[PDB]
Design a protein around this nucleic acid. Structure first.
Length: 293
RNA sequence: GGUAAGUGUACUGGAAAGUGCACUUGCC
């Protein structure tokens, strides 16, 4: 539940500029409380604004706008996590993948406790081209915490280079655009808020299943300041770990003295592609959870 | 020594913050 509100008509209006030209668009907004952005979206001449809101306190104020803008704002009382936007718009709007993005957009100012699990849920959806991505390469404009925004957009060798960097950037073009200060919200939180734009890639930079990249990225990054080989080890049961780790790094041409923050997405394609071949040869390797064995 | 803030720093795929460490400022 949200307890810090963005109501500056200057900042909500600037968020919807960064989403692009929406002048006949079908927009799905997830966050809206006081509808600050909601008002900003409707003044952009969208075709429809679909809006989901769990908190009932905000729905009378959203109806306030479904009448000041008749035939423009569809309201839904619901949970953005259970809600299926795959069926919220017509099949006529579905563009192919190797086309341009569709006329469907996601804009969102969720609580960070909702938006952080959800961006990963949506990243898996991009992988499977289902979910919000039945329409094609649906773009999304979301608010994360200043720090989380930088991790999604971080390049190699930087300090915010985390798991979220690779899980996002291999599937999406990611632009951390600007950062609103906490003082602009009401009441003020003890954090700053970043704004990030996602555009799904026609060809992902790793073509492996999402759960496979997940596992490689999770193990590379689990020991954070150390040699990246400290983490890649744990993909392999102890009995084969010495030989399977050396074979992994050598075939992928990875320097084991590299740190997790130093590995390009190219390095992950090589690690993932070779790890994919190891699981094809040993059908019971992929399930090795080192945490107990 | 115990404690609580603040600052810096490290980490977080469950970040409107949290935790470790260092220093500073107060207190017991």
């Amino acid at each position: 539940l949200s307890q810090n509100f963005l109501l500056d008509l200057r900042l909500t209006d600037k968020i919807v500029r960064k989403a692009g030209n929406l002048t006949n668009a079908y927009v799905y907004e997830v966050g809206p409380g006081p509808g600050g952005i909601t008002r900003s979206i409707l003044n952009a001449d969208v075709a429809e604004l679909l809006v989901v809101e769990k908190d009932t306190r905000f729905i009378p104020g959203l109806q306030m706008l479904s009448d000041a803008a008749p035939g423009k704002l569809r309201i839904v009382h619901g949970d953005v996590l259970t809600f299926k936007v795959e069926k919220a718009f017509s099949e006529s709007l579905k563009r192919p993948w190797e086309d341009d993005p569709p006329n469907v957009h996601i804009i969102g100012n969720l609580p960070f406790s909702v938006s952080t699990p959800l961006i990963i849920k949506w990243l898996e959806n991009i992988s499977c081209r289902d979910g919000p991505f039945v329409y094609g390469r649906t773009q999304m404009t979301l608010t994360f915490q200043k720090e989380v925004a930088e991790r999604l957009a971080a390049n190699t060798g930087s300090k915010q280079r985390s798991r979220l960097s690779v899980m996002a950037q291999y599937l999406c073009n990611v632009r951390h655009i600007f950062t609103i200060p906490g003082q602009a919200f009401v009441p003020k939180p003890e954090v700053d808020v970043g704004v990030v734009h996602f555009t799904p890639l026609i060809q992902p930079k790793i073509e492996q299943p999402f759960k496979l990249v997940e596992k490689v990225v999770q193990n590379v990054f689990q020991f954070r300041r150390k040699y990246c080989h400290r983490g890649l080890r744990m993909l392999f049961p102890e009995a084969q770990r010495l030989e399977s780790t050396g074979r992994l790094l050598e075939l992928a041409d990875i320097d084991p003295t590299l740190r997790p923050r130093q590995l390009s997405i190219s390095h992950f394609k090589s690690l993932c592609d070779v790890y994919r071949k190891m699981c094809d040869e040993d059908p019971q390797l992929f399930a090795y959870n080192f945490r107990e064995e």
